[model samples]
Target: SVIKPEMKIKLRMEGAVNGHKFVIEGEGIGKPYEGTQTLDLTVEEGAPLPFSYDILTPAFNRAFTKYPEDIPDYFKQAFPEGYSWERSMTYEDQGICIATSDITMEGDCFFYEIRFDGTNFPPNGPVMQKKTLKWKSPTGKMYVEDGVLKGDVEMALLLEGGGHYRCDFKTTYKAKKDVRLPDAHEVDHRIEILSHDKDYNKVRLYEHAEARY
Candidate 1:
């Protein structure tokens, strides 16, 4: 299949355990990476929309510790500078995020998505109230949807933090068909933190894969 330049893609994943729910959002330029001679994509920026969940279970501090080591070497090589194996969720206790080189190919279509998520607690920070927090993407939020595959993604945060407290976060990528990898097929990508105001921040999450005929 032939790929084009300047394609736009946006991905979102929402998951919950017990009474808590988390959301992750990402936005950036999508195309094939050149160096690896493989279709590559990158998430220039992203953040979490804040919401409230009851502390029903143990708020595991190191929930995302093994993410970096879990990723495949091909994906590691795809983004030599963009990827770091040592930087696991343990370091960024707030969350864990990474991409995979594991691609699933079926006929002329390819499917894969970058995935990331983490919830952190600061040892000496303020505690948050156990109230229900609702969240949604900001106005003018643009992302690559199913049909539209190229453009900029816009997002927003919806929450009210009591003080310097951190909230739980979850993120994922879901893609199928006609997605262009960036930089001549190099598979390196990045997840950026756009804001960190006690309540929420923009976290970019991405997934890259190809289908061979």
Candidate 2:
């Protein structure tokens, strides 16, 4: 069935990293606009286009994700520094990440990403090797259903002797149950490191590296 724009109860401009020229389709607009109307609709030159994630998904289902686009940015803005864990060993009011190492994260409690650099991995060399690790969240996938955030999660890692090995992890959130975090963005980013010494709701160092400075 073709969605006749004229039949759409509500229609508005979508978001684009670029400007002016944009995209639209019947399926894209949910059976209201057909054939991807790639035309033009102009308002004030600088007028902000209406963007509704109501039709958008975090990380847009990407293999690897970052900030300014989804969950990562949400966490930073809401908590800024990081969640206090402020509580939770295996209990987070909203979301959680469980593992057997040191890890750090940025973004919404529901959806975010991993940041690995020289500190976590010294500038070794172009060698080759394998490593093993595991990540088990409350569940995997992140989304809000019936006014509740939900998903199932699983992680794995493997490592070999010296040479050069591979060490990596990944993740990708919404909410329900009136769950509330410690407002990471509301505090002074106090020196309180609540994400460490624990392996849940936070990222930690799998193996604390001896300073190489």
Q: Pick the lDDT winner.
A: 1
In candidate 2, what are the lDDT values of residues 146-179, reduced to their tens digit? 4432333232222233332222223323321134
Model 2's C-alpha root-mean-square deviation from the true structure amounts to 20.5
- Number of clashing pairs, model 1? 36
Off by over 4 Å in 1: 16-20, 25-28, 34-88, 92-120, 123-213
**For each candidate, how many residue pairs have backbone atoms clashing (under 3 Å)?**
36, 31
Q: Write the per-residue lDDT of candidate 1 for residues 1-213, one digit (tens) a residue.
A: 222233333333344322234544333344443211122222233323333321211111111111223322233132212211111222122422222212332332223333333345333322133242322321111133433312122212233453222323221223333333222111122223323344434322233333111
